[PDB]
């Protein structure tokens, strides 16, 4: 494949590995989730633009809208977690 | 008359887990109403 | 078979819609009428089986087992109603419903043409039987008895299901009439060795085969009287009936595959007979006695001779009445002294003279006195296994001696000697109890006059 | 008047009882007809 | 929560699932999962306590991660085939990513850990949605991509879910965790037969939902979340103990009950394909489920546990919960085996 | 002059499965190991 | 319409019914402090519904025909026996207290239901909020064990958190030497066995713990035995309260729909009074509870749901 | 796995014992590493070295079980001159079971492992001879 797909795919894997390998802050994991969306956006846009598939030009915008909305929900859970414990540390989320 | 479970028999199923181990020795049954104290 | 299925189902509304104080009268009376009509199944032909429909048939193997099943329901009702007298009315009706639902599954099990239908019904009998033991047993370890009984069965029955479905795919059918004509020989291969074991192990557990038998004494010690009666008389014979049918499609592999089970049976019958000499629980002694008798049935089925199959059929019927009668006799003592310990209440012939006679007759049939059908069945098996190998007569003969020893030991220990001084509540035998004992032994002894109706298809 | 508080189901809900029975009668009539046109259509198609 | 908002949110949960089931475009499938996750989070949180917030967060993180893996597979699929049609995928790495994405959504082992955690932390009614309705959308996608799924991956996932689900339930005293592990094992049966006959996947799914809804509905009618609380049922509503007994025997696959049907039919399909070892192993492992189902029947219906004096006060009041559809569901949960040939309507 | 063993085996296997810390970090770390194994060992990506 | 989300959606919202009159008032005090007479006066002067103090048979009075049931259907809890023998080894003392907390809890849910469905205020005599003063006195006097107090607090923790406290707490203060005098004149043979130490413990809990806690969240009005006689002055004070504290100010229609959905379902209300905690004093063996339960079903109008009992004259059962 | 498993089956029974022992030890060690990876990830070791010790215990135990099985099973086939015999794997399976009893310092685990590993190994040989399928390709 073209050069770019290597690095974009590598970027997605890096953020996925970052997502699966938590540290302490829940916000850091949420950043890795949005990093994955970004690389999906770029890889989608490049594929759609290069093939000149015109109607799919909207697809990456739809992806950005829904992922941002998902990110807003994730942020809401983060603040509700932080209100309970005073931090967003994931090791506080072990009652279950 | 026919035997029925007593308190000692019933208390087997009241713990956090069915089979206690050293790993889960600190586990406690969750709150009755699901609400942990603030 | 609808003339038996439907009236059996109607026993349920009969029981639930009866007046509170008529539940035992009505269920007993009408179950006896169903038992009477069951004798219409004796229309057997020399060549063809009695094939009612696409679902059910009755040959000379299933007919005697059907009659025994429907005879046993009123006897279980009579035997149960005393220790359930304090139960509330709804729970009494639920108990009777389990017994009726057990009859329904059993008569369908014995008459199904297709083997998957037999499997489902064969499995369905587990539910009411398990519920009868765990809900209406007296002691704490009835819960464990249920799990042992449940999981011994399913450990063998699930491989049977896989084999049955595999056989239908290969052959195209599991209708037993079709299998008789489309059966093909089983060649040697590891695949066929496991097909053989999957086709047989479920029935071995039910019998039970020696070495897979420890669930049985556990179950009997915990079951209420009706549970023991149906378990000893009918539920064990489901495995015997299953083996007699499925061996059709296992030749010639049964030739060498039977050996380890024959060895277990031949030696197991001596071991379990000896164990009876040292049992201290009367119910556990009768349970071990069943294991020893059913070991003969397993040998008969595995060696596959016309004489052995006839003996197996007679032994299965004869044992069912005899063992059920012994549990009823043991239970009559228990309802007075509230213990199963055999040595607790001695010298009971002095106190209960007529019940001593029933004990005597039950013991005489248990040790197979000629010409009881107990001996007829045992003798036919002994005849046939001698041809299989002459040395078997040594183990057969030794087992006869030990069986006489423990059968009469039971009789001498409980009925003879001196009575226990402090046991002062041995009230006279009730009419219900005397009728119950006589309703076992009289038909058993009347079968001596016409044994042919219990000798099965090979007759 | 046994009950201290009037039970919720002291009196039958006559609107509900009428709707219930109307539904049962409607469904049975719709089913019976449905069967009849199915039988006629089946015979017509197969020439019976 | 306002009752109108609750209704609109529930309709959004259903709508997102329905979008997945009617969509021919991978993007709309992905939207349906996104819509569906957004609307279910508030019903997980509706009791507002630390355990519900933890469950909601764990659920969000799992489902969001699976949605990104799903979209990655879709985009890889677009690169190598240039189209978005929902069907077989045209790249084996896309197939593996989507299979693992869908396995995560279903909560199959080894992606199972969230199912007991999340189910315990949310109300019974929310747990009912999580373990039934939420299975439809991922299963409907697996129903369409199965020709391109790797057999070893799908069968490995199926075998692990049956093992983990069975062993996980043995150690449980919480009813919600019992349901969670029971659910994990049942998913393994559903996906094990998928490579052979998807119709038997649908049959297993429908019956599992019926039996699962019955148990949750009965737990809700009494407000029982633990085994010991459920052991007081005999001294309040004796009929419920009998119904719970029958449904538990059915969820264990005992004939002649309805729950025997899906395992019976799955064993048949596998053997028709000369698969003997796998169905045999699955059937025997399923005896683990039967053990801890039977344990509940012992403490609930077949014995009588000790009661408390204040229980007498409860005798004076009736059940006011709706228990909607329970009489129908319990009958279907237990008495459907004579109608097994009706499965052809799923073809 | 065994049911106990099978039951003991299952009981032990149950404590291995269910004795878990409840930590987000450890569960998602196990997802990475599963994904790595699925590729390197079994080649489920082919 | 039976109240539910549909009735709420169609306009059955609490704020339409409730006014400034919509107040929950409870009257507290020691034994023989005159709280009952004052409670009735406050109710009729302010036009509120009076609830007499919930006793052992409060639950009976709200179900069936309203008449008390035999004692075996309350567990044989006896206030008379509690006085005759406080340290009975049958566990009567705490069995009674655990029962009375459940009775008060039931009454509180009934009073809250009345307020939310009609808008009319209510007057209670003691409540789940003040029920612990008897627990504390029993424990300090050795009548109950510490394990009983642990059980009581568990039940209280997961029950009282669901409810709103009274708008107004009217406390009548009578000294222990006076209370003991009022008891003697009353002439109750069993109640005359009470000790001043027990009475003093009741007072300490009211002043040590109850009143300091209520004042944070309620309007607390205190009166002496003499001042409590002028019910017009007491009623005059209530009408001048500002109602500036407490959670009642945070409530709205949505949060009151949830509360009404709870208090109208008495089994939800009583769910945790029967937590499976095996305390000897409140645990009942299976054989006994099975036997008593069967007898209960045999009482008139108790076999079936209310409205489905032919033995008490219910009709049209085949259309209901 | 496919590469290593195919190597084991390619070598005929009772010939090239060392080559068989490498395949099983490699297979056993890989299984032990897999167990260690999950054990470390889910049950966190107290210290880094403690994690390294645990990986060595599981990885050596699994490799030792695999090594003895391949050695024992292949010698038996060679000594007995019975290549396509399931009993050789029954002997090998039990030997591996005993080592587990030794590593865990239990006679019960050794007795159970002998029976459970021995039957499993013998069934694998019947499956190879008879062509039994564990993950069967969809045919119908
Ligand atoms: C072949 C495979 C095997 C067989 C498959 C069969 C599948 C089952 C078929 C569906 C069975 C649903 C139950 C039928 C209704 C029976 C209950 C009843 O009589 O309600 C009468 C109902 C009121 O009865 P109720 O006293 O309030 O409570 C009845 C049940 O307890 C209330 O029980 P509920 O709380 O569970 O609610 C039941 C009903 C909601 O309750 C209802 O309003 C009845 C609606 C039933 C519709 C029946 C149509 C069936 C034909 C389908 C086409 O649910 C629905 O909305 C049905 C959709 O009267 C009506 O309003 C008639 C419906 C008018 C439209
Ligand atoms: C796990 C143990 C399974 C044993 C292996 C059975 C097997 O998979 O054999 C495959 C064979 C189907 O192969 P096929 O292509 O159809 O025909 C050519 C024969 N090679 O299958 C067959 O030919 C026969 C299949 C019969 C079904 C066997 C059922 C399970 C057998 C194991 C249990 C038997 C022991 C029962 C123990 C009960 C315990 C109480
Ligand atoms: C065939 C299976 C039939 C499934 C029927 C399920 C009936 C719903 C359960 C009845 C229990 C009574 C009830 O109240 O519903 C439970 C729940 C309501 O939640 P609740 O806590 O009672 O109050 C919410 C207000 N905040 O209501 C819910 O949350 C809905 C839960 C059920 C939705 C999933 C149903 C299963 C999938 C249906 C597709 C079948 C294929
Ligand atoms: C037809 C094809 C399909 C065939 C498959 C078989 C389907 C059967 C399952 C059907 C679905 C479940 C419905 C079962 C109906 C149960 C009816 C019943 O048991 O009686 C109810 C009784 C009521 O008790 P109560 O509230 O107190 O009112 C009476 C006053 N005592 O309750 C009680 O009194 C409680 C008594 C204690 C419980 C005793 C436990 C033993 C009774 C078990 C009977 C149910 C067996 C179900 C299991 C499946 C059977 C195969
Ligand atoms: C624990 C026991 C697990 C089995 C031992 C591992 C093994 O030897 O099988 C690994 C399996 C090899 O199978 P493979 O070479 O990929 O060819 C496809 C065969 N139908 O590799 C696989 O593809 C499946 C991996 C199985 C994972 C454990 C279940
Ligand atoms: C899909 C493709 C991947 C195939 C592999 C899937 C395996 C997934 C296993 C995830 C569930 C395992 C849960 C579990 O067993 O707990 C973790 C366990 C801890 O147990 P451990 O400490 O090793 O034993 C000694 C305890 N005294 O740690 C373990 O040892 C688990 C090892 C499982 C190996 C299989
Ligand atoms: C429309 C479709 C539905 C079709 C339903 C067809 C059957 C309808 C039956 C209605 C009559 C029910 O009858 C009602 O219940 C039972 C048995 O009947 C009777 O009461 C019963 O009590 C006990 C059993 O507990 C027994 O003495 C006896 O079974 C009977 O007297 C009631 O006194 C009667 O009022
Ligand atoms: C309580 C349980 C009792 C269990 C009793 C166990 C009995 C064991 C029977 C052993 C015989 C099994 O069946 C045996 O399988 C092998 C399969 O390889 C068949 O043999 C087949 O494979 C071998 C390979 O080694 C070839 O040499 C042979 O040419 C081929 O036909 C044999 O023809 C058959 O005899
Ligand atoms: C857990 C981390 C996940 C990270 C995911 C990162 C995205 C990676 C996308 C990789 C897509 C490459 O996909 C892979 O490309 C090569 C390029 O021809 C394909 O082609 C390869 O295999 C096929 C086999 O028939 C043939 O074309 C040829 O042998 C070979 O070139 C593979 O069939 C395909 O599987
Ligand atoms: C082959 C098919 C048939 C097999 C069916 C298997 C179904 C699974 C059965 C349940 C397994 C776990 O069940 C559990 O087992 C262990 C060990 O026996 C029991 O444990 C009990 O006995 C062991 C000793 O034997 C004690 O160390 C333990 O303290 C005690 O509690 C549990 O009381 C039981 O609940
Ligand atoms: N053990 C115990 N007794 C209680 C409890 N609540 C009330 N009582 C008893 O109920 C009896 C009557 O209630 P009281 O209000 O205190 O006395 P009263 O004279 O009838 O009422 P007033 O004078 O108007 O205040 C008292 O003797 C109390 O001992 C309680 O929670 N525990
Ligand atoms: N066997 C599969 N894996 N798939 C599948 N269902 N194939 C189609 C075979 C089939 C079976 C029953 C019916 I009714 C119909 Cl119409 C068609
Ligand atoms: Mg008063």
Inform me whether the C-beta atom of residue A21 falls under 8 Å from chain E C-beta atoms: no
CA-CA-CA-CA torsion for F13, F15, F21, F22, nearest 10 degrees? Answer: 80
Q: Which residues of G touch E304 (CB under 8 A)?
A: 286, 289-290
Interface of F with A in 2-41 (CB under 8 A): 21-25, 28-29, 31-32, 35
Question: D25-31 — which CB contacts under 8 Å span 24+ positions?
Answer: none
* DSSP summary character for residue E229: H
Percentages (nearest 5) of helix, strand, coil residues in chain C: 75, 0, 25
Task: Give residue C227 CA to ligand 4 midpoint distance, Å.
Answer: 18
**Would you state the structure tokens that stand for residue G111, as one six-digit string?**
């009073």
* Strand pairing class (C50-51; C57-58): antiparallel
**Would you state the structure tokens that stand for residue G1, as one six-digit string?**
């319409």
Q: Are E248 and E326 in contact (CB under 8 A)?
A: no
Q: What angle do CA G311, G314, G317 make, to 5 degrees?
A: 105
CA-wise closest residue to E169 among E315, E20, E327, E290 = E290
CA-CA-CA-CA torsion for C436, C438, C441, C443, nearest 10 degrees? Answer: -100
CA-wise closest residue to C266 among C288, C295, C243 = C295
Interface of E with H in 179-238 (CB under 8 A): 195-196
Strands (E), G78-181: 122-125, 168-173
Q: What angle do CA C135, C137, C140 make, to 5 degrees?
A: 95
Q: Tell me, yes or no, whether chains B and G touch by having 3 or more C-beta pairs under 8 A.
A: yes
Whole-angstrom distance, CA of residue E211 vs CA of residue E290: 14
Q: Could you tell me the resolution of this structure in angstroms?
A: 2.3
Task: Give first-to-last CA distance, chain E, whole Å.
Answer: 41
Per-residue CA distances from E93 to C34, E76, E102, E146, F39 (Å): 67, 8, 14, 14, 10
Nearest protein Cα to ligand 12, atom 11: E347
**G224, containing H or E segment:** strand G219-224
Q: Are E108 and E183 in contact (CB under 8 A)?
A: no
**C228, containing H or E segment:** helix C225-230
Nearest protein Cα to ligand 3, atom 19: E125
Is the Cβ atom of E345 under 6 angstroms away from ligand 12? no
CB within 6 Å of ligand 10 — which residues? C 151, 155; E 170, 284, 287-288, 291; F 4, 6-8, 10-11
Burial of E222 (0-12, 13-18, 19+ CB in 10 A): buried
Task: Give first-to-last CA distance, chain B, whole Å.
Answer: 49
CA-CA-CA-CA torsion for C439, C444, C448, C453, nearest 10 degrees? Answer: 100
Q: What angle do CA C287, C290, C292 make, to 5 degrees?
A: 115
Inform me whether the C-beta atom of residue E279 falls under 8 Å from chain F C-beta atoms: no
Per-residue CA distances from C375 to C291, C317, F13, H1 (Å): 17, 12, 51, 63
Is the Cβ atom of C189 under 6 angstroms away from ligand 8? yes
Task: Give residue E154 CA to ligand 9 midpoint distance, Å.
Answer: 19
> Can you tell me which atom of ligand 10 is nearest the CA of E284?
2
Inform me whether the C-beta atom of residue E328 falls under 8 Å from chain B C-beta atoms: no
Q: What's the gap in Å between the CA of B23 and the closest CA on chain E?
A: 13
Q: How far is CA B7 from the centre of its chain?
A: 12
CA-CA-CA-CA torsion for H95, H101, H104, H107, nearest 10 degrees? Answer: -170
Buried b (16+ CB within 10 A) or exposed e, H68-80: bbbbbbbbbbbee
For residue G125, report the phi and psi dihedrals to the nearest 5 degrees: -110, 105
* DSSP summary character for residue C421: T
Give the three-class secondary structure for C384. Answer: helix
* DSSP summary character for residue C455: S
Burial of E104 (0-12, 13-18, 19+ CB in 10 A): buried
Per-residue CA distances from G272 to E320, G112, G160, G279 (Å): 17, 19, 10, 15
Q: Are E242 and E301 in contact (CB under 8 A)?
A: yes
Nearest-ligand number for the alpha carbon of C88: 4
Inform me whether the C-beta atom of residue C89 falls under 8 Å from chain E C-beta atoms: no
Per-residue CA distances from F32 to C333, E100, E243, F37, H56 (Å): 68, 12, 43, 8, 21
Burial of D16 (0-12, 13-18, 19+ CB in 10 A): exposed
**Would you state the structure tokens that stand for residue F8, as one six-digit string?**
């003991």
β-bridge partners, G221:
G170
Whole-angstrom distance, CA of residue C308 vs CA of residue C389: 13
Q: What's the gap in Å between the CA of E277 and the closest CA on chain H?
A: 6
Contacts of H122 (CB under 8 A, 6+ apart): H86, H87, H89, H90, H93
Per-residue CA distances from C201 to C153, C198, C209, C246 (Å): 9, 6, 9, 11
Q: How far is CA G22 from the centre of its chain?
A: 19
Q: Are E321 and G2 in contact (CB under 8 A)?
A: no
Q: What's the gap in Å between the CA of H127 and the closest CA on chain E?
A: 10
Give the three-class secondary structure for C320. Answer: helix
Please answer yes or no on whether C120 and E256 come within 8 Å at the CB atom.
Answer: yes
| Tokens 């945070």, located at residue | G250
Best residue among C191, C193, C195 to mutate for probing ligand 8, ranked by most atoms within 8 Å of CB: C193
**Would you state the structure tokens that stand for residue A30, as one six-digit string?**
């949420």
Q: Are E173 and B17 in contact (CB under 8 A)?
A: yes
Q: Return the number of other C-beta atoms located less than 10 Å from residue E151's C-beta.
A: 15
Give the three-class secondary structure for H41. Answer: helix
Partner residue opposite B14 with nearest CB, options G276, G283, G287: G276
Q: How far is CA C348 from the centre of its chain?
A: 28
| Tokens 């420890």, located at residue | C214
Q: Are E290 and E178 in contact (CB under 8 A)?
A: no
Q: How many CA atoms lie within 13 A of C33 on its CB side?
A: 10
Left, alpha or beta for B34 (phi > 0: left; psi -120 to 50: alpha)? left
The number of helix segments (H) and strand segments (E) in chain F equals 2, 0
Best residue among E267, E271, E274, E276 to mutate for probing ligand 2, ranked by most atoms within 8 Å of CB: E276
CB within 6 Å of ligand 6 — which residues? E 110, 156, 160, 164; F 16-17, 34, 37-38; H 34-35, 38-39, 42-43
Partner residue opposite E164 with nearest CB, options F10, F17, F34: F17
Burial of H48 (0-12, 13-18, 19+ CB in 10 A): exposed
Give the three-class secondary structure for C224. Answer: coil
Q: What angle do CA E44, E48, E51 make, to 5 degrees?
A: 70
Q: What angle do CA E311, E315, E318 make, to 5 degrees?
A: 125
Task: Give residue G66 CA to ligand 7 midpoint distance, Å.
Answer: 29
Burial of E287 (0-12, 13-18, 19+ CB in 10 A): middle
Give the three-class secondary structure for G96. Answer: helix
> Can you tell me which atom of ligand 10 is nearest the CA of E292?
10
Q: Which residues of G touch D9 (CB under 8 A)?
A: 305-308, 320
Whole-angstrom distance, CA of residue E30 vs CA of residue E20: 8
Nearest protein Cα to ligand 5, atom 1: H31
Q: Which residues of E touch G298 (CB under 8 A)?
A: none
Q: Which residues of B touch G278 (CB under 8 A)?
A: 7, 10-11, 14
Q: Where are the alpha helices (DSSP H) in C89-214?
A: 89-111, 115-124, 126-136, 142-171, 176-182, 190-206
**G50, containing H or E segment:** strand G49-50
Is the Cβ atom of E81 under 6 angstroms away from ligand 9? no
For residue G30, report the phi and psi dihedrals to the nearest 5 degrees: -80, -170
> Can you tell me which atom of ligand 8 is nearest the CA of H85?
25
**A42, containing H or E segment:** helix A26-51
Partner residue opposite E3 with nearest CB, options G9, G60, G302: G9
* DSSP summary character for residue G11: T
Say how many residues make up chain G: 320
**C51, containing H or E segment:** strand C50-51
Whole-angstrom distance, CA of residue E104 vs CA of residue E37: 14
Interface of E with F in 235-264 (CB under 8 A): none
Is the Cβ atom of E196 under 6 angstroms away from ligand 12? yes
Q: Which residues of E touch C151 (CB under 8 A)?
A: 287, 290-291
Q: Return the number of other C-beta atoms located less than 10 Å from residue F34's C-beta.
A: 20
Contacts of E114 (CB under 8 A, 6+ apart): E58, E59, E62, E107, F27
Q: What's the gap in Å between the CA of F15 and the closest CA on chain A?
A: 16
* Strand pairing class (G24-29; G168-173): parallel
CA-wise closest residue to H139 among E275, E148, C173, E280 = E275
| Tokens 């889910």, located at residue | H42
Whole-angstrom distance, CA of residue A10 vs CA of residue B1: 73
CA-wise closest residue to C308 among C378, C256, C234 = C378
Q: How many CA atoms lie within 13 A of D11 on its CB side?
A: 5
Q: Are C458 and C311 in contact (CB under 8 A)?
A: no
Most H-contacting residue of F30, F31, F32, F45 (CB-CB within 10 A), to test interface: F30
Omega prior to C208 cis, within 30 of 0: yes
| Tokens 């373990």, located at residue | E131
Chain breaks in chain D (C to N over 2.5 A) after: none
Q: Are E298 and C134 in contact (CB under 8 A)?
A: yes
**Would you state the structure tokens that stand for residue B2, as one six-digit string?**
């026919």
CA-wise closest residue to C189 among H119, E274, H130, E276 = H130
| Domains of chain A, CATH where assigned | 3-85 (1.10.287.3510)
Nearest-by-CA chain C residue for H122: C190
Task: Give residue C241 CA to ligand 11 midpoint distance, Å.
Answer: 74
* Strand pairing class (G49-50; G24-29): unpaired
* Strand pairing class (G168-173; G219-224): parallel
Sign of CA pseudo-dihedral A49, A53, A55, A61: negative
Per-residue CA distances from B11 to C139, C146, E169, E229, G63 (Å): 19, 21, 19, 12, 34
Whole-angstrom distance, CA of residue A25 vs CA of residue A38: 21
Is the Cβ atom of E249 under 6 angstroms away from ligand 4? yes
Per-residue CA distances from C278 to C4, C232, C274, C294 (Å): 43, 21, 7, 20
Please answer yes or no on whether E273 and H136 come within 8 Å at the CB atom.
Answer: yes
């Amino acid at each position: 494949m073209s050069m770019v797909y290597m690095n974009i795919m590598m970027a997605f894997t890096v953020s996925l590995v970052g997502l699966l390998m938590y540290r302490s802050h829940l916000m850091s994991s949420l950043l890795c989730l949005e990093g994955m969306m970004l690389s999906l956006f770029v890889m989608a846009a490049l594929t759609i633009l290069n093939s000149h598939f015109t109607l799919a030009s909207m697809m990456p915008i739809i992806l950005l809208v829904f992922a941002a909305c998902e990110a807003a929900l994730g942020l809401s859970l983060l603040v509700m977690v932080s209100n309970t414990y005073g931090t967003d540390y994931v090791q506080n989320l072990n009652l279950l | 008359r026919q035997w029925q479970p007593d308190v000692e028999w019933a208390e087997q199923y009241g713990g956090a887990v069915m089979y206690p181990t050293k790993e889960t020795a600190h586990w406690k049954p969750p709150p009755w109403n699901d609400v942990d104290p603030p | 078979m609808l003339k038996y299925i439907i009236p059996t189902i109607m026993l349920m509304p009969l029981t639930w819609l009866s007046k509170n104080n008529m539940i035992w009268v009505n269920s007993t009376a009408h179950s006896l009428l169903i038992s009477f009509t069951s004798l219409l199944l004796m229309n057997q032909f020399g060549d063809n089986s009695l094939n009612f429909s696409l679902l059910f048939f009755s040959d000379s193997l299933s007919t005697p087992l059907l009659i025994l099943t429907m005879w046993l329901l009123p006897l279980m009702l009579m035997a149960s109603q005393h220790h359930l007298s304090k139960e509330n009315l709804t729970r009494k009706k639920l108990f009777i419903t389990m017994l009726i639902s057990l009859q329904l599954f059993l008569i369908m099990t014995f008459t199904a043409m297709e083997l998957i239908l037999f499997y489902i019904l064969f499995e369905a009998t587990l539910v009411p039987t398990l519920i009868i033991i765990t809900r209406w047993g007296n002691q704490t370890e009835r819960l464990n008895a249920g799990l042992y009984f449940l999981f011994y069965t399913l450990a063998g029955s699930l491989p049977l299901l896989v084999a049955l479905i595999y056989i239908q795919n290969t052959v195209g059918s599991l209708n037993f009439l079709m299998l008789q004509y489309w059966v093909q020989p089983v060649h040697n291969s590891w695949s066929n060795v496991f097909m053989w074991l999957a086709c047989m192990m479920a029935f071995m557990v039910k019998m039970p085969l020696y070495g897979l038998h420890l669930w049985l004494p556990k179950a009997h010690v915990e079951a209420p009287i009706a549970g023991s009666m149906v378990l000893a008389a009918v539920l064990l014979k489901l495995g015997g009936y299953g083996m007699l049918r499925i061996t059709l499609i296992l030749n010639p592999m049964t030739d060498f595959m039977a050996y380890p089970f024959i060895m277990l049976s031949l030696w197991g019958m001596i071991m379990t007979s000896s164990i009876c000499l040292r049992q201290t629980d009367l119910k556990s002694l009768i349970a071990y006695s069943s294991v020893s008798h059913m070991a003969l049935v397993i040998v008969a089925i595995l060696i596959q001779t016309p004489w052995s199959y006839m003996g197996a059929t007679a032994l299965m019927i004869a044992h069912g009445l005899t063992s059920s009668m012994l549990f009823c006799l043991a239970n009559s003592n228990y309802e007075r002294i509230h213990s199963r310990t055999m040595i607790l209440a001695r010298g009971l012939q002095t106190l209960l003279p007529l019940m001593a006679t029933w004990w005597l007759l039950a013991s005489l049939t248990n040790l197979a006195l000629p010409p009881t059908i107990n001996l007829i069945g045992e003798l036919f098996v002994v005849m046939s296994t001698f041809s299989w190998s002459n040395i078997t007569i040594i183990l057969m003969g030794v087992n006869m001696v030990i069986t006489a020893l423990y059968s009469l030991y039971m009789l001498i220990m409980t009925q003879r000697g001196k009575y226990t001084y402090h046991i002062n509540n041995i009230s006279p035998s009730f009419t219900r109890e005397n009728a119950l004992m006589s309703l076992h032994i009289l038909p058993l002894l009347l079968l001596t006059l016409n044994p042919k109706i219990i000798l099965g298809p090979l007759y | 008047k046994f009950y201290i508080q009037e039970p919720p189901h002291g009196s039958p809900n006559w609107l509900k009882v009428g709707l219930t029975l109307g539904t049962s009668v409607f469904l049975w009539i719709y089913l019976i007809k449905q069967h009849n046109e199915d039988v006629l259509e089946y015979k017509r198609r197969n020439g019976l | 929560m306002n009752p109108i908002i609750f209704i609109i949110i529930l309709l959004t949960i259903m709508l997102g699932t329905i979008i997945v089931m009617i969509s021919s475009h991978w993007l709309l499938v992905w939207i349906g999962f996104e819509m569906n996750m957004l609307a279910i989070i508030p019903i997980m949180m509706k009791n507002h306590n630390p355990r519900a917030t933890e469950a909601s967060t764990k659920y969000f993180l799992t489902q969001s991660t699976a949605s990104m893996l799903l979209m990655m597979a879709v985009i890889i699929n677009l690169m190598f085939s240039g189209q978005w049609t929902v069907m077989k995928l045209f790249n084996p790495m896309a197939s593996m990513l989507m299979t693992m994405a869908l396995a995560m959504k279903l909560g199959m082992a080894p992606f199972h850990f969230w199912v007991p955690e999340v189910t315990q932390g949310i109300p019974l009614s929310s747990g009912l949605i999580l373990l039934t309705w939420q299975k439809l959308a991922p299963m409907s996608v697996l129903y369409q991509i199965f020709p391109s799924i790797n057999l070893n991956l799908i069968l490995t996932l199926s075998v692990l879910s049956i093992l983990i689900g069975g062993w996980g339930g043995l150690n449980q005293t919480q009813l919600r965790k019992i349901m969670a592990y029971s659910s994990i094992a049942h998913m393994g049966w559903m996906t094990a037969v998928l490579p052979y006959n998807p119709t038997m996947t649908l049959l297993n799914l429908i019956i599992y939902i019926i039996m699962t809804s019955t148990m949750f509905t009965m737990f809700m009618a009494n407000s029982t979340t633990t085994t010991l609380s459920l052991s007081h049922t005999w001294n309040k509503t004796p009929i419920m103990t009998v119904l719970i007994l029958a449904t538990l025997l059915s969820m264990g696959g005992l004939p002649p009950l309805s729950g025997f049907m899906p395992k019976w039919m799955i064993i048949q399909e596998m053997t028709k394909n000369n698969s003997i070892i796998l169905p045999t192993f699955m059937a025997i492992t399923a005896l683990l489920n039967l053990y801890f189902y039977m344990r509940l029947t012992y403490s609930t219906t077949l014995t009588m546990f000790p009661s408390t004096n204040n229980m007498k006060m409860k005798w004076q009041f009736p059940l006011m919960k709706k228990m909607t559809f329970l009489p129908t569901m319990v009958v279907l949960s237990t008495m459907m085996l004579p109608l097994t040939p009706m499965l052809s309507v799923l073809e | 002059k065994l049911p106990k063993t099978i039951s003991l085996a299952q009981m032990k296997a149950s404590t291995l499965v269910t004795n878990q810390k409840g930590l987000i970090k450890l569960y998602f770390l196990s997802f990475l190991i599963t994904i790595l194994i699925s590729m390197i060992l079994f080649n489920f990506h082919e | 319409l039976q109240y539910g989300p549909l009735a709420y959606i169609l306009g059955e919202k609490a704020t339409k019914k409730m006014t400034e009159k919509s107040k929950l008032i409870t009257v507290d005090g020691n034994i023989c402090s005159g709280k009952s007479k004052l409670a009735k006066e406050i109710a009729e002067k302010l036009g509120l519904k009076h609830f007499p103090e919930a006793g052992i048979h409060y639950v009976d009075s709200t179900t069936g025909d309203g008449k008390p049931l035999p004692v075996q259907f309350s567990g044989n809890c006896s206030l008379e026996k509690f006085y005759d023998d406080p340290k009975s080894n049958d566990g009567n003392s705490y069995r009674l207290q655990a029962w009375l907390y459940a009775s008060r809890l039931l009454q509180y849910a009934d009073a809250l239901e009345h307020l939310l469905s009609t808008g009319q205020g209510v007057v209670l005599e003691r409540s789940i909020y003040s029920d612990f003063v008897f627990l504390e006195a029993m424990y300090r006097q050795g009548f109950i064990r510490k394990q009983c107090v642990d059980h009581y607090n568990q039940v209280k923790k997961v029950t009282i958190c669901e409810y709103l406290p009274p708008h107004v707490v009217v406390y009548v203060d009578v000294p222990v030497p006076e209370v003991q005098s009022r008891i003697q004149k009353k002439g109750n043979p069993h109640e005359m066995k009470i000790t001043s130490a027990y009475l003093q413990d009741i007072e300490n809990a009211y002043k040590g713990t109850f009143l300091p806690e209520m004042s944070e969240k309620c309007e607390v009005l205190q009166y002496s035995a003499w001042e409590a006689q002028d019910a017009e002055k007491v009623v005059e004070d209530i009408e001048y309260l500002k109602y500036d504290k407490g959670p009642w100010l945070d409530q709205n229609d949505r949060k009151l729909h949830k509360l009404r959905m709870l208090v109208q379902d008495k089994l939800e209300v009583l769910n945790y009074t029967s937590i499976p905690v095996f305390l000897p004093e409140v645990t009942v063996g299976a054989h006994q509870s099975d036997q008593v339960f069967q007898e209960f079903t045999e009482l008139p109008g108790r076999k079936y749901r209310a409205g489905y009992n032919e033995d008490v004259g219910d009709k049209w059962i085949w259309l209901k | 796995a496919k590469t290593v498993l195919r190597q084991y089956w390619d070598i005929p029974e009772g010939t090239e014992c060392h080559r068989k022992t490498y395949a099983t030890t490699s297979i056993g060690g890989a299984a032990g590493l897999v167990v260690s990876a999950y054990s470390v990830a889910l049950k966190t070791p107290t210290s880094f070295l403690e994690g390294v010790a645990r990986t060595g215990r599981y990885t050596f135990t699994a490799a030792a079980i695999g090594a003895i099985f391949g050695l024992t099973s292949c010698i038996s086939a060679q000594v007995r001159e019975k290549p396509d015999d399931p009993l050789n794997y029954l002997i090998g399976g039990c030997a591996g079971g005993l080592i587990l009893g030794a590593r865990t310092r239990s006679y019960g685990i050794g007795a159970a492992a002998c029976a459970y590993m021995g039957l499993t190994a013998a069934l694998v040989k019947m499956g190879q001879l008879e062509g039994w399928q564990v993950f069967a390709e969809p045919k119908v």
